[PDB]
Amino acid sequence: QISVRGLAGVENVTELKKNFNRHLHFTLVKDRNVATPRDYYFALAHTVRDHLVGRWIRTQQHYYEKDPKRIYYLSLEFYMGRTLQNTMVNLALENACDEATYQLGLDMEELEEIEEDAGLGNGGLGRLAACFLDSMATLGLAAYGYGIRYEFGIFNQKICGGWQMEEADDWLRYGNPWEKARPEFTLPVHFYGRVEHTSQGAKWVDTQVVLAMPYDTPVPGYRNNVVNTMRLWSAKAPNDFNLGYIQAVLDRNLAENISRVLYPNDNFFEGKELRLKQEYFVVAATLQDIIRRFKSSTNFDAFPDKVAIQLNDTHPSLAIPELMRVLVDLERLDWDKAWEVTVKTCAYTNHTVLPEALERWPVHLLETLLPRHLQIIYEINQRFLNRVAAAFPGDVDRLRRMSLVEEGAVKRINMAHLCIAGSHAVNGVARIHSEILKKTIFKDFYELEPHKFQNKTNGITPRRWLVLCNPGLAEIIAERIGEEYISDLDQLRKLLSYVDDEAFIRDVAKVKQENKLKFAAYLEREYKVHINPNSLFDVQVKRIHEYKRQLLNCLHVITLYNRIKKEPNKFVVPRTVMIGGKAAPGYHMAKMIIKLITAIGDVVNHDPVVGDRLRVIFLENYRVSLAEKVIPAADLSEQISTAGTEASGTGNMKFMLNGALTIGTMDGANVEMAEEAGEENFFIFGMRVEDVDRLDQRGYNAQEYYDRIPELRQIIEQLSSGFFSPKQPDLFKDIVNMLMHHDRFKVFADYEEYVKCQERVSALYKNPREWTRMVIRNIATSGKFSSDRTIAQYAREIWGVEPSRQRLPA
Amino acid sequence: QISVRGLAGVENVTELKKNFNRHLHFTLVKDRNVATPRDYYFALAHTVRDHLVGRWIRTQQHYYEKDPKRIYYLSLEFYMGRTLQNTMVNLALENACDEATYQLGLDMEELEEIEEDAGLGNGGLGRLAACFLDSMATLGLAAYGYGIRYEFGIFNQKICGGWQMEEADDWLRYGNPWEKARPEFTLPVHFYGRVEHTSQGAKWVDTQVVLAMPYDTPVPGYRNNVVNTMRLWSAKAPNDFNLGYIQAVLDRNLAENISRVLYPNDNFFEGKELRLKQEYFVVAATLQDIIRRFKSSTNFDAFPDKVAIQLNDTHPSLAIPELMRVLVDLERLDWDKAWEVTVKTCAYTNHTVLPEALERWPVHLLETLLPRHLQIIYEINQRFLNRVAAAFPGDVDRLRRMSLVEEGAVKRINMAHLCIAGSHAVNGVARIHSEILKKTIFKDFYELEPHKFQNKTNGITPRRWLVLCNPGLAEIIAERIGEEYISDLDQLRKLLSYVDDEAFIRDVAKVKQENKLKFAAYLEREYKVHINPNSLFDVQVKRIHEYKRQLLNCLHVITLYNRIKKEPNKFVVPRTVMIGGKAAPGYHMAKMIIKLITAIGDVVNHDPVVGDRLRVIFLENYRVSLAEKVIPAADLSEQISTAGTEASGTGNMKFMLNGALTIGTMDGANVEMAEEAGEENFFIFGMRVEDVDRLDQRGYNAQEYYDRIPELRQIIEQLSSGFFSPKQPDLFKDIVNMLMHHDRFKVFADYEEYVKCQERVSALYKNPREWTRMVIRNIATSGKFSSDRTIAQYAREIWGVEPSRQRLPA
């Protein structure tokens, strides 16, 4: 039906129908009389998978023959979401599959909804890794994603009595048709033991062994016939493990727990032994695989010419001492040569400056679990500090600040300092964040080695985040400027010539309206709730965290409610305020924020004086598949973190691409988005980084704001007195106490400017033509935020490889 | 090449090659350049599996339409072995697959050796269940096997320093291509809780829930296009299970442990809670499935007309109170009606009279785990004892003996008594065993309800145990009498007309000689040991147990050694004595017996005076796939259990079919084998049951035999003094002490007759023509021991269904 979804040729459709029926019969062992919709989904997924495998084999064969430099992207998280539609988009099969299924009496959209998200990440960091894989394949890079195949991904969120409850995400229950187990490339990983010093070096002995079994998933590029690999490791006990008899078999679970569950924290370091085991597990298995592939092309001087290892935050930082262990202890390279190879091979991306997010492992843990790695870390530290002392003689405090070993009650290893010492490139993820790294937390390292420090502003894939989730928008764009923009997003600039075009204005608004109707209906069906689709859709979706300031949004919502109640017969622009996201299970304040949001909804949504002027909805179980539905429906994107706290953001970019305007602080990538679109086309408010710093020097006193702003005082009195919790009047006292006395994120300091800026949003929404013209100016300038741009910069400036848009033969 | 393996038509071969390459490419995601032999095995298995699925769907469809009476065979064990060859045999595909693989440059026999045994049983009981499934499919019965999908089957046995070591049997590591997961038919199973009595009956509440997920495996009949189902249940935790967060997810293993591992005991009741959970798990899931299928054909009067449930020993005995629970508590039938339905539905097969093998569960366990079932058991008992009291008034001791509840230190439920009370048929597994049941342990029950008690002599499938494992023998038989004997084994009687046929005599001996050469070579390759293939192959393979008397065999072997050493220059018929089998991990005496056998080997095999006259080999890791290799190579089958202890045996039958002569006691099915072949064609020795009873009344005194038999005294002195363990002279004192003072199985009492009978074996082996003529008389009369005969008797005399040799259409 729509051009960007490709051709539905008679031959293709016939062949797809044949293969669908073949899989239903032979693969699934069903006939049409007892097949369920889930069987039909699987028969389609196997049909589409067959089209990948030829390209997958040929791509991997091509890399063996050409022997290009290989890029290894190491991450503890790959937030992939669903695969079926993305595969169809990238193979140009969507219209053919639609037609084929339609002729079989089936609705393909319904089958798509059956697939489970691969929820192997927490939020932005995990999703960035997924976008990056898509871009590396699209740009023809010989790239491999390496991670852990968690049995349970990010928990499913249920809301019960307004509180978050967690349920296990048993995503593999019905099988995963996309992966291929490769038990033949199973590798041993060692833990515990002790170090023996012999005549010819150190030996790590008496270890416990866990096997790492790989599962491979194909990663198709956009219409270029390249299919790369994501290799995820699963933990298995050896067969002699603990080998009365019955108990020894049941105790195999202790080893296999390593890959059981994703730690559900976003921007918070928990410090548990199981997490450290996960980190080493992924690193040790991956590095053996890398070395095997290198040897099957003595001479490790060429290793950095054939291998790049990108560390996604510090989570895989043990790659640095593990590489040194292998080169020194097993290959018998001298230390200095090994270190040169290591530094030239590794590069580190930092994703946060929040102190509670930084990994600082207790020395006693490393000593017990990884005794050889601790020795190597100490030697790295001594040699590194010797360089510092030579460059800054007498500066004893600098030595203490830069040490990999932190002194204190418990000695800890600072993993970020290890990553900087052992990498040839260190980057932040947006311009403001990379500057903050050089001025504050890594200032000392920047002064020693300025050449290491770079910026690589984040991006998102326009395949998933435009073509897949918003085909109506993709199509009206394609009608004007063709299809090349899908792999060259800078071509969206051509849309600025259609800012005064009456037909284009109408089409952009029509597509938004359709997306809003479709989402309003989705809400009714799956969650028994009614919304006005003519209201402004005001959306804040992201993990729940104090720094992201869902609480600031809550204060605005209550302000609007109180204004309506004060002057009920005055016109206000109707809004549907939607907030969604998961709280980490142990993060009490985040769980209280969720409860506050639902409690505000319980009052606002049932007040007959409000009517359909204001609705507050908590969107349950926010995840990649839900993002694909809500983002195309949004009018206003809330990006309201305290300046200096959101390293980049990527949700922000998804909203910009899909025709929402942004209300935001000058934080993370918001700064660059505003620069690209023009500040006049963005709703900027609040303290800049420098203003936050000035307040911190003086002392933040929240009481001053309470005393000066009557509207704010009223809200705090309502919270304290039980207005939003009549049966439990003190339910929110922890929230009030934090806001008044211990608010690290200065919610009150941005309240007045936020409310005023929100009034400007409402004023523009009253003039649909001008709202839509501003939207066009945003979409048109979103090209910089393609992850294709991001990856091309990594490739050229860090990895030393050239991207290619050349197609492999089919 | 050979006729019984079917046709290799050009069209068939071409199609198999095409599909093999299709699976290698699309299913396995390999090309020929990186494929391993394991990949080739999987590509073949998927190719053969495709030929099953059409017949499988059609068979199950046919049962839905015709609605025949369904037979449910409940077992905790299904000892299946490998599937690939058996599937080819039953579909007549073996020669075509051989030719197809040969044209691809591959050796099919090598690929077959890659497949793991499905080792989901311990020995005879589990293997009987597997033979039965094959016969039920071959006889066109609408039959379902129901069990547990253990993650770890019977342990792999390694011998280290002559001792058994156990290793986990991780049989699913590389995947199982034969099964199909059916997560859509997942069912809840309840544990713990308590009983509430309401106005309208008992309710079982506050239970813990475990999910039972079914996996289905096809069971093809012999060339009749029938494919039945074996449904095995796997334990899964619900997603809200224990739902800090991380620990709750890791604790899901506690529920999933139910299906983790097979208890490795043969003829020994251990009494562990986990085993009871396994028993209930299989019963509760299976009964829900049965009832669902019955309702999808109010009125449970027709239930026994549409359903038969066969209990494989007492392991699934909880089916009786579970059926009552469902009918009374959930369907609201009155007790008497429910009991009538239950009794008419259930039948019980007993497999042992050894007292330590009988299940007697402590009441406190049932009270905690299954409180409603315990109440139902007590009510069954009271009503049953009321009938006993009315039939035998005043006989208070009979009431105590027959009670389902045993008094004592700990009260126990006798599960055999429950099975008799709640079944319309009770059978033993060989004539002598069924008679023993009526005279001894179930005498009281027989007097109350004589009509319940039957015999069904065991059997083996001639598909696996002749055609598959011994194609050379199958072929030379087929050349004379055609192929119909493979599904009608009584036709082997026609071979008696070829007992004086010189060509047939020569061919029978030639096939044995070929099998011996092939096995001698297998031993060299896989286990670095050399044997004389002209020696008599004297084989005892079965689980290690005192009752099976591997020790009696050991005494004969030492006797032969001592005779050689006494008169080294006298001719003796050369022998290779092979003993193999697993010991249960906690059965200390069984483990000592293994060590004795290897220690005898260490002395005998290295004595230069013995030469190649005598070799003693312990066959490591005895299992179904090893049975298929060693049994066709055997000359002498050792079946030497103390009279009254081996309920039937089935190894005995496998040897008879494959051209070995038998040395044995009049125990189990040996009695019927000797009756069929003629006692003159069997090497019978030792005490009969009545002689054992006479010795028990007088008192067995082993010292008397030691005092009277100099050859026996010498052996005991050798064991005691360290002749077979020079570095640890007292290593075998537990064995000596048991034989001299606490031998329940009267080894010494049968020693003299055993040695004399063995001398008669040697004398016959010296005359190859007469040995082979006796062999022909055994093979010719083995027809009774087809499991097809056994199943036809169950079908007619217990289940009330008619077997059919009619083919479904292809």
Ligand SMILES: O=C(O)c1ccc(-c2nnc([C@@H]3O[C@H](CO)[C@@H](O)[C@H](O)[C@H]3O)[nH]2)cc1
């Ligand atoms: O489990 C942990 O220990 C953990 C998880 C995520 C993070 C994390 N740190 N930063 C992020 C997000 O990364 C994305 C992608 O760069 C940025 O857009 C966000 O600004 C940042 O918060 N996530 C830190 C620690």
Ligand SMILES: O=C(O)c1ccc(-c2nnc([C@@H]3O[C@H](CO)[C@@H](O)[C@H](O)[C@H]3O)[nH]2)cc1
């Ligand atoms: O795990 C247990 O608790 C268990 C296992 C097997 C047995 C068992 N009882 N009898 C058998 C064997 O059954 C076969 C098949 O009928 C007979 O041929 C053997 O004689 C018998 O020992 N096995 C008892 C208990």
Ligand SMILES: O=c1[nH]cnc2c1ncn2[C@@H]1O[C@@H](COP(=O)(O)O)[C@@H](O)[C@H]1O
């Ligand atoms: O000996 C070979 N001949 C041809 N191709 C090979 C050989 N070894 C590896 N390859 C290719 O590389 C393999 C995948 O690379 P790996 O990820 O290093 O195992 C296969 O996909 C092959 O296409």
Ligand SMILES: O=c1[nH]cnc2c1ncn2[C@@H]1O[C@@H](COP(=O)(O)O)[C@@H](O)[C@H]1O
């Ligand atoms: O509604 C129906 N129409 C046709 N066949 C059915 C229907 N329901 C069940 N069946 C058959 O029975 C099913 C298997 O039986 P089950 O083991 O009871 O699920 C399928 O194999 C079908 O062939």
Ligand SMILES: *Cc1c(COP(=O)(O)O)cnc(C)c1O
């Ligand atoms: C993009 C995305 C995020 C990151 O959003 P931010 O607003 O940048 O934190 C988190 N979760 C999901 C499911 C996403 O798709």
Ligand SMILES: *Cc1c(COP(=O)(O)O)cnc(C)c1O
């Ligand atoms: C047949 C068989 C048995 C039973 O043999 P018995 O000699 O009757 O105990 C045990 N194990 C395996 C592997 C078998 O094939």
